[PDB]
């Protein structure tokens, strides 16, 4: 399998302007007839090179002439000797029922549906499967009426009829030219929730949500979120929907979260289906986020698409930024920012330190599906957010307007987007562009000095990015570095120099630079990298008292949570070193006191209190260390929880009780209270055993919602309480028929601290609610074990690696995309000790020798073993 390089981009020799598709649909054998209008742009002797994978070719005609001048090759149909403009007709067969990879057209339960990103359309017919080829689609679908009463594709229904032998047909037309990755087709029998949205200019849009029969009770929240998303994009970005119908289909079998196919999104049902007894506050907020995300792609992705797949961040980073702004505008901005920063620090930073490290605009790709990553999405969004920081909302919106004005109806590049931002704002972004082409996390080191004779505060700031496996050379970036200075009363000291105000976003552009501030009347406590103003690691020699001062006085809630994180980092690092020497936890009294003060503070937003009282996960803790000791990290996290539970027992129980809510509401004040209450519960589960057991068991049984029932169940598992086995069995007996609800239970089983966790996980491969045919089940059981239980995955006997190898040996053949997601914990070997590395290398060498090794795994394994 051959690498492809961004620098090799070349305009296509042929364009296809219009394509008329017919599907004679059947799960065993689908016949596709594709009639394309092609125009040559390249040299008159250039052949037409169509992509195709796993297709049975039936015929090729050019202007209705059976064509003799073609050859099939690996992944291609090469057609020679063509006129300048012509009608191409291809007939080919495919088999949805045999498509276990879930790429192209496949079977999802009884339904047929598509997943065409990045390059799945070539699994349906021979085509120019590249996103700079934009065609107007019309799609006719012919199927058995009883099996497939609903036949959906992009756009509007323009014809329909019935046939003999119990078949019917529908034809769809989408007036907007589109790259083929936005093609979608759905056939099946569904319940449909129907509603309407009227755009600000008065266009009435029919909204239709298709769910499996019986699931209509779980549909209204997603419909509500869709209307919320539409309204918000109008208010915030001035964008309206541009078609007459918006369809969403929820499918159980889906390798991704959701896809933005024009006017016909297809969603993993995990991001659609919610009822208060089945779904948590977090599920509700995730549905909102992902409904919004796919809706926001209508402009940032669809009306302006990607010239090539190396530009993936152009749509994904910008759309993630938009979904974050949506969630933040509608909810708690501080909570959203906190959560996204934890994802950056705990998950993305790890990827940027891995063999798969890549810039947000990659330079080299073997399997494009390997690059739908935390880097392209989450760091890509941090990069858009830095442009927003540098320009401010007004200029940023001007740049959006110029971007759409220039690029509406075409495929664009990351560079085009930056250029629009720069032209609209008159902010020079040429050094800034380096964030697109350099991989790795910068480390920003800050030293300060207060001069009492001159009343000046000096920050000496430096930056470096360590070399990564993909790039030996690194250069300084344009780092927006937001600061705030506090006097001893907690008041902000105006920033100024030489009689003029200074902007609080510093431009850190050099390897080393000094910034001097005048009229600093008192020695300041600084807040640094405010609101995580750049995606970097900060090195500053904090005192404990500077941090607790900030937790008490910082103006932005983010800064208070972030000061607590820096405070905790110090003692997590201390206690991991202690664990390694056989010693128990040590924590100064004044550190527990800072957390007591948060619990008892009446003025603090419960949303903030809740996040400060949620300890960093084992993955966030891992990023504090050069060499990861996952067993010490897990045990230290538990010991810290036990220590805080003992020191704060009375305060924890008071706040738990005060935040009781008899009514369940999916509303941001109610959610904040309940998140605080359940954060208290986590600690309380580690109190005196009988007391803990009673409290947890009672919450589980009296819960009037899944958020509270799951928080109880999770605490019983985490603290290994006596009630655990009974509660876990009760949930199984109640919920086994419901895969999405069982995913929560598989996760708890997979991440359990019990000594026998792997044995339990292996037995659950035979559980009635588990199946290897379903990516959600796989991710909930196997993926959560390997990625979210590193202590057990990295068991010293190497049993975790051997288990993952057995699972990937199956999935490599069955569903390479899911296999490649799941291999990720194994490729982090260089972060671990020598003895672990050699077992992990051994596991990777075993996988490398697999017969029919997928390109998806090949790419990661070869990087990991380099």
Q: For helices 557-580 and 544-553, give the axis angle rounded to 10 degrees.
A: 150
CA 817/CA 367 separation, integer angstroms: 10
Q: Which of residues 303-342 bind Zn ion (CB under 5 A)?
A: 316, 319
Provide the minimum distance between the beta carbon of 304 and Zn ion in the complex, in angstroms, as a whole number: 14
Name 450's Cβ contacts closer than 8 Å, sequence gap at least 6.
456, 457, 458, 520, 523, 524
Nearer to Zn ion, 246 or 801 (CB): 246
Q: Are 417 and 433 spatial neighbours (Cβ–Cβ below 8 Å)?
A: no
Nearer to Zn ion, 87 or 328 (CB): 328
Q: Are 177 and 136 spatial neighbours (Cβ–Cβ below 8 Å)?
A: yes
Nearer to Zn ion, 315 or 860 (CB): 315
Q: Are 391 and 421 spatial neighbours (Cβ–Cβ below 8 Å)?
A: yes
Three-state SS sequence of 233-256: HHHHHCCCCCCCEEEEEEECCCCC
Name 87's Cβ contacts closer than 8 Å, sequence gap at least 6.
35, 36, 37, 38, 61, 62, 63, 64
The order of strands in the sheet holding 136-144 is: 65-66, 56-62, 85-94, 30-40, 14-24, 136-144, 167-173, 156-162
Q: Which of residues 188-207 bind Zn ion (CB under 5 A)?
A: none
Helix, coil or strand: residue 542: coil
Nearer to Zn ion, 264 or 479 (CB): 264
Nearer to Zn ion, 190 or 377 (CB): 377
Provide the minimum distance between the beta carbon of 315 and Zn ion in the complex, in angstroms, as a whole number: 6
Nearer to Zn ion, 118 or 636 (CB): 118
Host H or E run for residue 656: helix 649-658
- Length of the chain as a residue count: 866
294 is catalytic: yes
Helix, coil or strand: residue 802: helix
Q: Which of residues 60-79 bind Zn ion (CB under 5 A)?
A: none
Provide the minimum distance between the beta carbon of 319 and Zn ion in the complex, in angstroms, as a whole number: 5
Provide the minimum distance between the beta carbon of 498 and Zn ion in the complex, in angstroms, as a whole number: 46
Q: Which of 294, 316, 325, 824 is catalytic?
A: 294
Nearer to Zn ion, 257 or 855 (CB): 257
CA 388/CA 395 separation, integer angstroms: 8
CA 179/CA 16 separation, integer angstroms: 10
Q: Are 847 and 857 spatial neighbours (Cβ–Cβ below 8 Å)?
A: yes
Q: Are 357 and 467 spatial neighbours (Cβ–Cβ below 8 Å)?
A: no
Provide the minimum distance between the beta carbon of 316 and Zn ion in the complex, in angstroms, as a whole number: 5
DSSP 8-state class, residue 615: P
Number of residues that bind Zn ion (CB under 5 A): 2
Helix, coil or strand: residue 513: strand
Provide the minimum distance between the beta carbon of 259 and Zn ion in the complex, in angstroms, as a whole number: 8
Q: Are 62 and 86 spatial neighbours (Cβ–Cβ below 8 Å)?
A: yes
Nearer to Zn ion, 319 or 780 (CB): 319
CA 19/CA 127 separation, integer angstroms: 10
Provide the minimum distance between the beta carbon of 384 and Zn ion in the complex, in angstroms, as a whole number: 13
Nearer to Zn ion, 86 or 267 (CB): 267
Nearer to Zn ion, 15 or 319 (CB): 319
401: left (phi over 0), alpha (psi -120 to 50) or beta: alpha
Provide the minimum distance between the beta carbon of 156 and Zn ion in the complex, in angstroms, as a whole number: 24
Provide the minimum distance between the beta carbon of 853 and Zn ion in the complex, in angstroms, as a whole number: 28
Q: How far is CA 511 from CA 363, 460, 462, 507, 514, in A?
A: 25, 11, 5, 12, 11
Nearer to Zn ion, 261 or 659 (CB): 261
Provide the minimum distance between the beta carbon of 225 and Zn ion in the complex, in angstroms, as a whole number: 16
H helices present in 736-828, as ranges: 739-750, 757-763, 775-778, 784-788, 790-793, 799-814, 816-823
Provide the minimum distance between the beta carbon of 186 and Zn ion in the complex, in angstroms, as a whole number: 19
CA 847/CA 824 separation, integer angstroms: 13
- Of 90, 40, 47, 53, nearest to 69 by C-alpha is 47
- Of 418, 369, 388, nearest to 103 by C-alpha is 369
Q: Are 698 and 633 spatial neighbours (Cβ–Cβ below 8 Å)?
A: no
DSSP 8-state class, residue 847: H
State whether the Cα torsion 243-106-279-193 is positive or negative.
positive
Which positions lie near Zn ion, rule CB under 5 A?
316, 319
User: Which residues are the active-site residues?
Assistant: 294
């Amino acid at each position: 399998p051959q690498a492809k390089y961004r620098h090799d981009y070349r305009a296509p020799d042929y364009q296809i302007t219009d394509i008329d598709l017919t599907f004679d649909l059947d799960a065993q054998k689908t016949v596709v007839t594709a009639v394309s209008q092609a125009v040559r742009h390249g040299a008159s002797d250039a052949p037409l090179r169509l992509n195709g994978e796993d297709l049975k070719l039936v015929s090729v005609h050019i202007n209705d002439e059976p064509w003799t001048a073609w050859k099939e090759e690996e992944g291609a149909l090469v057609i020679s000797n063509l006129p300048e403009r012509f009608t191409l007709k291809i007939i080919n067969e495919i088999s949805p029922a045999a498509n276990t990879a879930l790429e192209g057209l496949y079977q999802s339960g009884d339904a047929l549906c598509t997943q065409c990103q990045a390059e799945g359309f070539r699994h349906i017919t021979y085509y120019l499967d590249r996103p700079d080829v934009l065609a107007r689609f019309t799609t006719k679908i012919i199927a058995d009426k009883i099996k497939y009463p609903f036949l959906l594709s992009n756009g509007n229904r323009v014809a329909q009829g019935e046939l003999e032998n119990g078949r019917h047909w529908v034809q769809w037309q989408d007036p907007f030219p589109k790259p083929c990755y936005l093609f979608a087709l759905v056939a099946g029998d569904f319940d449909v929730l129907r509603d309407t949205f009227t755009t600000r200019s008065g266009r009435e849009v029919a909204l239709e949500l298709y769910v499996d029969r019986g699931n209509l009770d779980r549909a209204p929240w997603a419909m509500t979120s869709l209307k919320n998303s539409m309204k918000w994009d109008e208010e915030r970005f001035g964008l309206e929907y541009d078609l007459d119908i918006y369809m969403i289909v929820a499918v159980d079998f889906f390798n991704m979260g959701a896809m933005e196919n024009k006017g016909l999104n297809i969603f993993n049902s995990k991001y659609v289906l919610a009822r208060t007894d089945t779904a948590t506050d977090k599920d509700y907020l995730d549905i909102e986020r992902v409904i919004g995300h796919e809706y926001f792609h209508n402009w940032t992705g669809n009306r302006v698409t990607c010239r090539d797949w190396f530009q993936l961040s152009l749509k994904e980073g910008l759309t993630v930024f938009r979904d974050q702004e949506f969630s933040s505008d509608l909810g708690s901005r501080a909570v959203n920012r906190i959560n996204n920063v934890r994802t950056m620090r705990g998950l993305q930073f790890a990827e940027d330190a891995s063999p798969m490290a890549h810039p947000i605009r990659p330079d080299m790709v073997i399997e494009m599906n390997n690059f739908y990553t935390l880097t392209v999405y989450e760091k890509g969004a941090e990069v858009i957010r830095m442009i927003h920081t540098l320009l401010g909302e007004e200029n940023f919106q001007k740049g959006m307007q110029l971007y759409f004005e220039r690029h509406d109806g075409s495929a664009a590049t990351c560079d085009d987007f930056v250029q629009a931002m720069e032209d609209a704002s008159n902010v020079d972004l040429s050094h800034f562009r380096r964030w697109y082409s350099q991989s790795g996390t910068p480390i920003v080191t800050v030293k300060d000095d207060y001069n009492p004779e001159t009343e000046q505060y000096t920050l000496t700031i430096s930056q470096r990015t360590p070399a990564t496996p993909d790039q030996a050379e690194k250069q300084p970036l344009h780092i927006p570095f937001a600061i705030e200075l506090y006097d001893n009363e907690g008041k902000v000291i105006p920033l100024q120099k030489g009689g003029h105000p200074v902007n609080s976003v510093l431009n850190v552009t050099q390897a080393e630079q000094t910034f001097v501030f005048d009229n600093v009347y008192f020695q300041p406590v600084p807040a640094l990298l405010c609101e995580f103003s750049a995606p970097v690691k900060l090195e500053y020699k904090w005192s404990d008292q500077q941090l607790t001062f900030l937790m008490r006085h910082a103006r932005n809630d983010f800064s208070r949570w972030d000061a607590a994180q820096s405070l905790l980092a110090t003692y997590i690092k201390l206690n991991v070193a202690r664990h390694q020497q056989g010693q128990p936890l040590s924590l100064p009294v004044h550190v527990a006191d800072a957390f007591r003060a948060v619990l008892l503070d009446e003025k603090i937003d419960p949303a903030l209190a809740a996040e400060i009282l949620t300890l960093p996960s084992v993955n966030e803790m891992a990023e504090l260390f050069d060499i990861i000791d996952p067993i010490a990290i897990a045990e230290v996290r538990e010991a810290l929880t036990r220590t805080l539970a003992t020191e704060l027992a009375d305060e924890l129980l008071a706040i738990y009780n005060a935040n009781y809510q008899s009514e369940y509401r999916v509303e941001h004040e109610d959610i904040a209270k309940r998140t605080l209450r359940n954060a208290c519960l986590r600690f309380l589960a580690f109190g005196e055993t009988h007391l803990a057991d009673v409290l947890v068991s009672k919450q589980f049984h009296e819960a009037n919602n899944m958020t509270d029932a799951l928080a109880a169940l999770s605490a019983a598992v985490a603290a290994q309480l006596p009630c655990r086995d009974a509660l876990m069995q009760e949930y199984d007996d109640k919920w086994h028929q419901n895969g999405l609800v069982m995913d929560k239970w598989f996760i708890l089983q997979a991440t359990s601290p019990a000594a026998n966790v792997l044995e339990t996980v292996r037995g659950l491969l035979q559980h009635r609610s588990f199946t290897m045919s379903n990516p959600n089940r796989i991710r909930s059981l196997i993926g959560a074990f390997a990625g979210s239980n590193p202590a057990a995955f990295h068991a010293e006997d190497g049993s975790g690696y051997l288990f993952l190898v057995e699972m990937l040996t199956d999935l490599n053949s069955r569903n390479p995309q899911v296999a490649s997601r799941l291999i990720e914990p194994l490729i982090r070997l260089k972060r671990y000790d020598a003895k672990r590395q050699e077992k992990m290398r051994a596991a990777l060498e075993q996988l490398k020798g697999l017969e029919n090794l997928s390109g998806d795994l090949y790419e990661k394994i070869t990087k990991a073993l380099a």
